Design a protein around this nucleic acid. Structure first.
Lengths: 154, 391, 385, 334
DNA sequence: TCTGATTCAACTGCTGAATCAG
DNA sequence: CTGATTCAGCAGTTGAATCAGA
C-alpha cells in the first residue's frame, strides 16, 4: 500500500501450457537437451522464454528501458557465457562432454546483473540467456554446433 | 518595524507564487497555469475553461468583510472583465483566496449561491445591507468613498452577468499558513513522508524560477502543467530513494530456541549433522528474518511483491546451486554434500528491492523456505525427513 | 493586456527573494540575511556590519538615472535610516541592485566614489546638475515635484552623513536576468554542472518557502546563512563510457607491447588478443576522458588499480594452490579469466561491462601484473627468442 | 610551499579565467615571463589574472584601467630609464634585459596586463574551502588534495620548460570531481599511512602474526598483513572519531565477516581435506581475503577488509588453520 | 472587555504614455 | 532613434482609530 516502484516490475501471467510443446522445435531447445538436460526444467525454461519475451515486448511498447540497455546487457551476458564456457571446458575437462555442458548451464544460470541500475525479475536472465542460445549467440555444449547439425539430419 | 519596510504585503505577492504552485499540483493534464496574465493567478485547461484567482493574504484585516474594500474591488474588476467582448463567462470560474478562515454574510451567501435564484437572493441581501430598501436607498450616501465606485459598478451592472459571476464565484480559503496548506497537498500524493518537505520546496523554487525567467523577458508568465509534471516526476525519480534497510529484530534468548527444535528446518539441519550451536544460530536467524519480513511488510518498507520476488530468487539460486553441487562434489557422502549446499546458500546474498539486506535476513529466509520444504540441504532431505519422522 | 495585472511590478517583489538567495550564497560566515526587515534585502554579519539592498527590477525604465524617483527616494530613505540615533554608518554598506546594467551621470559618480573627498565632488556634481549653481539654485524650481522632497532631504541633510553614505553607496547591476546570475553563482561551486539547476531550483524553494512561512506568522523574515548552508550541504550530498570500438587496423599496432607478450606468454587463442587489445583501448580512452571532463577522480583510478592488483595477487595464490595439478598453460588461462570476472565498482559507481578487464589489461602492460604462473621468468625468455 | 598554497587559494577565488602566481630582479623577471607568455598566440590577456603575493607596484595595483595603466607605466619608465630622449639611466644588465623585453613590448598587451596585476596562508584557504557546499569534516582532505595536485601540475610544466599557468576551469574540473568522491558519502577515504619497515617488526610477537607464521606465509605477506593491520586500526579510530562511520556499522561489518569465516573455513576444510592442513589454512586465508562488502553501503579502501580480518585474528575472533587454537598453544611453548 | 468590521491614510512595487535632448 | 523626464494609474495589503455585537 502507498508504495513506490520506479523499478522493472514486469507485468506478466502464467504462460499457456500448449506453448510448451509448441516451442519444442525451437533452436534453443535442441541446444538444451543435447547436454542431457531433463524435460521438466526444459518446460520450465520454455515458460521462462515465454514470459521473458512478453516482458521484453511490454517494455519495448510501453517504454521503460532504453534500447542500448538490452544491447549492452546481452553483450556482457555473452562475454560471461564465453568466460564460464572456457572455465568449465578446462577445469571440468576430466569427464564427459555431456556433464560439462550441464554444469556450464547450471553455473551460468546463477548469474545476475542489474538493468539501468535496477533489478529485473528472477526469470529474466534465463530468458535472455536462451534468447542468445536461439541465434547461436551462446552455447551450453562445448561443441554445440556440431551436435546441432548432426541432430538436424537425424 | 519601520514604515519603509512592507513585509506583510510582499507576502501578498509571494502567496501568488504559492497558489500558482498549488494550482499546478491540482491542475488537470493539458493545462497552462499563468501568473498575472489573465488575473493574479489563472489556469487555462484543455477545454478552454479559464479559472481566475484573486489571492488576498490576510494577516490582520478581513478582505471578505461586507464593506471590505478588497472584496468589492475584486467583484468590480471581475464584472469589468465579464463586460469585455468575446468573453465566455460560463467558464470563468473566479476565486477570492484568503490566507485565513474569514466570515461575512454577503461573502458567504455569494460563495454558497450555486443556483441563480440563490445568487439573486445573495445580491438582494448585499444590496439591502449596503444601500437600503429599494428605491429610496437611504443608506447609499453613507457608504465609503473607496467602496463607492466599486459598489456602484457591481450593483448597477447587468443582472444576468452578475448572477453568473456570483454563481461561479468562490471563497476557497486555506488554513492560517498556505505554505503548510500546500505541503499537505504534496503529502496527499503517493510520496514518501520523508521526502515531502523536499519535493514541496523544490517545486516551489522551480516554479518561482521559471516564472521569473519568463517575466524578465517581458513574456507572459505561464507554466505548462505538462512541463510542471515532467519536472515533478523527473525530480521524484531523483530524490525518492532509500538505500539501507536497518533490521529491528533482536537475538532470541537461549530458552526460546529449543521451542523451535521440532520444526522441519531444524530436522533438516540435524539430518546432515550440524552442531548444536550452529542450529541455535539458525533458530535466531529464522526468528529475526520472520520478524523483519512481517515488520517491513507492515510499515511499508518493503512491498509484499518484493518479498515474492526475493523468495523466487532464493528458490532459483538454491536449485541452480544444488544441481551443480550434486555433480562437482559427487565423490563424497551425502551428508558432506548437504553441508556444502547449506553453507554455500548460507554465504549467498541478494538485494531486496535493490537494497542490501542484513547479514541474517537471507539465511533466515532460506530457513523459512526449508521449513516449508520448498528447499533442502540434504540431497535426499525429503526421504531423510520421512525416515526420521518414524524413528 | 489589461492594467489590472502587474507582472513587471511583481518582479520587483520576486527579485527580493531572488536577491535574498543570491546574497545568502555569498554571505560571509555567521550572517543573518533578512527580507523586508531592515530594508528590501539586508545582510548582518558577526562584526556588526549590515548591508541594506534596495533591489530595483529595472525592465522598461532607468532607476539609476540622473532624475529618477527610485534613486533619490532610495537615498532619502537611507538618510532617514542613518538619522536614527542608534545607527552608525561606518558599517552600513548600501546597495541599489538593478536588474539591467544601467548607467547615469550621477549614479556613476556615487558608485565610483570611495573616499570622502571624492564623494564631496560627487555631491557637488549632483547639486550642479540638479539644483544648479551653488548660490542661485536656478534649477531648484525646475526639479520635479516627485523628486523635489527627496532631493531636498538628500542635499540638506548632514554633509558628513551624506558624504559617508555616498562613500558606502554601491551600484550592483545584474545582467538582464537576475535569475541567471544566481545560477552563475551556483555553478561556480563544487557541484556537477549537470546538476546546477537542480540545486538552484531547490535553494530558492527553501529561501522562498521558509521566508514565506516566517512572514505568514507575522514574524521577522531572517534566514541564518548557517541554516541555508545546512540545507545546501544536505541537498548536495543527496558512469558512462565514450570509448568506441577501435578499428581492426589500429589493433595490430599494439602487438609489440608487453601486454600482448603476456596474453600469449601462456598463449591464448589469438582470437583473444583482438578482444583484449580492444578492451585495452576502450579503458585507456575512458580513464583519460573521465579524468578530463570530470566524472571520476584520478585518486579513484589509483585506488581501483591497487584493488585489482591485490585481487590478482590473491587470485594467483588461490589458483596456483588449488590447480597445482595442471600444466602452467592451464593455470595461466585459469588465473586470467577468473581475474576478468572480478566486479569491483569504481568509487562506488558501477563501471561499464568492459572497464574492469580493460583496466586489468592496462595494468598488465606494466610489469606489475600478468596471467601466467611464472610470467616474470618467461618475459625475458620470449624477448630473447 | 606557500607558492603552491596561495596559488590554490587564488584558483578558488577566480571566475572562469587563466591564472598564475609567483613570489629588483625577482619582481621584473616574473612579469617578463608573464609578458612573453601573454604574447603567445593562444593566451587571452583579458581573461588572465596574475598575482605577485609578497611605489611602482602600488601603481600597478592602483590602475584597474588602460589610461591609469598607461600612467603607471609612464611613471615606471620615467623612474627607471631616466630622461626619455637620452635614456641615461640604462647604465645592472641582468634585470636590464627583462626591462628591455617588457617596456619595448606591445603597449596594448602590457597595458591590459598591468590591470590584472593584483598583489597580496593555509587557514584562510581552509576557510574558503569550508565556505563551499562541502561537509566541514572533509575540508582538510580537499585542501590537501588540491594543494598536492596543483603542486604536481605546476612541477610537470616547470620541468618541461612551459609557462606556469593554471586555468581556473582546469582547477574546478579537479576539485568538483574530487568532491563527488569525498563529499558525497559513497566512498570512504583512508587517512591512514603505510607504516615504516622498522615499526612493523614491533608487531611480530602479536597473535595474528603468529597465526600467519603458523600458516607459513612468506616474509613479505606478513609485512603486508601488518601494514593492513595498522592502517585498518587507524581507519577504525579516525572514521568513528570524525563521525564518518557509526559503531553499529562496525558491529554489523564484524558480524558479516565472522559469518563469512564460518562458511569459508568449513567449506575449505571439507572440500580440500585431502590437501595438507597448512595448505588448507593458506587457502582459507586467501579465499576470505577476497571478500569485499560495503561498510554502510559505502565503499571502503581495498586494505580495510584485510585489516579487519587481522584485528579479528589478533583477538582470535578469526583464524586460518583448522586447529589454530591448538597451534597457537603449541607454538607459544616452543 | 474584547473580537471584530469600517473609513481612511499610506509605505512599498515598477510599467505605460506623451514629450524632449543629443 | 535610443535614452531620459514627468506624471500617472494599476497592484500589495497593513496600521491606526471608531463603532457594533456578544
Amino acid at each position: 500500500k502507498i508504495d513506490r516502484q520506479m523499478v522493472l516490475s514486469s507485468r506478466a501471467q502464467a504462460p499457456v501450457k500448449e506453448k510448451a510443446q509448441e516451442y519444442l522445435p525451437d533452436k534453443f531447445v535442441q541446444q538444451l537437451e543435447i547436454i542431457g538436460l531433463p524435460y521438466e526444467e526444459i518446460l520450465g525454461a520454455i515458460s521462462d522464454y515465454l514470459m521473458a519475451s512478453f516482458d521484453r515486448t511490454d517494455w519495448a511498447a510501453r517504454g521503460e528501458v532504453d534500447e542500448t540497455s538490452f544491447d549492452d546487457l546481452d553483450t556482457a551476458l555473452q562475454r560471461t557465457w564465453k568466460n564460464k564456457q572456457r572455465i568449465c571446458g578446462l577445469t571440468h575437462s576430466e569427464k564427459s562432454e555431456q556433464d560439462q555442458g550441464k554444469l556450464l548451464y547450471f553455473e551460468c544460470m546463477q548469474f545476475n546483473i542489474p538493468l539501468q541500475a535496477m533489478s529485473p525479475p528472477s526469470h529474466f536472465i534465463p530468458g535472455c540467456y536462451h534468447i542468445l542460445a536461439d541465434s547461436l549467440a551462446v552455447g551450453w555444449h562445448p561443441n554445440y554446433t556440431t551436435q546441432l547439425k548432426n541432430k538436424k539430419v537425424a | 518595524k519601520r514604515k519603509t519596510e512592507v513585509p506583510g504585503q510582499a507576502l501578498g505577492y509571494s502567496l501568488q507564487f504559492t497558489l500558482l504552485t498549488h494550482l499546478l499540483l491540482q491542475a488537470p493534464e493539458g493545462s497552462l497555469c499563468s501568473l498575472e496574465v489573465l488575473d493574479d493567478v489563472a489556469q487555462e485547461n484543455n477545454s478552454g475553461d479559464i479559472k481566475f484567482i484573486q489571492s488576498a493574504s490576510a494577516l490582520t484585516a478581513n478582505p471578505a468583510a461586507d464593506r471590505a474594500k478588497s472584496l468589492w474591488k475584486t467583484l468590480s474588476n471581475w464584472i469589468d472583465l465579464a463586460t469585455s467582448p468575446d468573453f465566455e463567462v460560463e467558464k470563468a470560474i473566479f476565486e477570492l483566496y484568503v490566507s485565513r478562515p474569514v466570515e461575512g454574510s454577503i461573502v458567504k451567501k455569494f460563495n454558497e449561491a450555486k443556483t441563480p435564484e440563490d445568487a439573486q437572493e445573495a445580491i438582494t441581501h448585499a444590496r439591502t445591507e449596503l444601500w437600503g430598501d429599494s428605491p429610496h436607498f437611504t443608506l447609499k450616501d453613507g457608504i465609503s468613498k473607496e467602496i463607492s465606485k466599486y459598489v456602484e459598478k457591481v450593483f448597477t451592472a447587468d443582472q444576468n452577468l452578475l448572477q453568473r459571476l456570483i454563481c461561479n464565484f468562490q471563497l476557497t480559503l486555506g488554513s492560517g499558513s498556505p505554505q503548510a496548506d500546500l505541503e499537505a497537498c504534496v503529502r496527499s500524493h503517493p510520496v514518501s513522508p520523508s521526502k515531502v518537505s523536499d519535493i514541496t520546496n523544490y517545486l516551489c523554487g522551480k516554479v518561482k524560477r521559471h516564472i521569473d525567467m519568463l517575466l524578465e523577458a517581458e513574456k507572459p508568465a505561464v507554466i505548462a502543467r505538462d512541463d510542471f509534471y515532467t519536472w515533478y516526476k523527473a525530480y521524484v525519480q531523483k530524490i525518492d530513494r532509500q538505500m539501507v534497510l536497518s533490521s529491528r529484530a533482536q537475538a532470541p534468548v537461549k530458552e526460546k530456541a529449543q521451542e523451535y527444535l521440532p520444526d522441519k528446518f531444524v530436522q533438516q539441519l540435524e539430518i546432515i549433522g550440524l552442531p548444536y550451536e550452529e542450529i541455535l544460530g539458525a533458530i535466531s536467524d529464522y526468528l529475526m528474518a520472520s520478524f523483519d519480513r512481517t515488520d517491513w511488510a507492515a510499515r511499508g518498507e518493503v512491498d509484499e511483491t518484493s518479498f515474492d520476488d526475493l523468495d523466487t530468487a532464493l528458490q532459483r539460486t538454491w536449485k541452480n546451486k544444488q544441481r551443480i553441487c550434486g555433480l562437482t562434489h559427487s565423490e563424497k557422502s551425502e551428508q558432506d554434500q548437504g553441508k556444502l549446499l547449506y553453507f554455500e546458500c548460507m554465504q549467498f546474498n541478494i538485494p531486496l528491492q535493490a537494497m542490501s539486506p542484513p547479514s541474517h535476513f537471507i539465511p533466515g529466509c532460506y530457513h523459512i523456505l526449508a521449513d516449508s520444504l520448498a528447499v533442502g540441504w540434504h540431497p535426499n532431505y525429503t526421504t531423510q525427513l520421512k525416515n526420521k519422522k518414524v524413528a
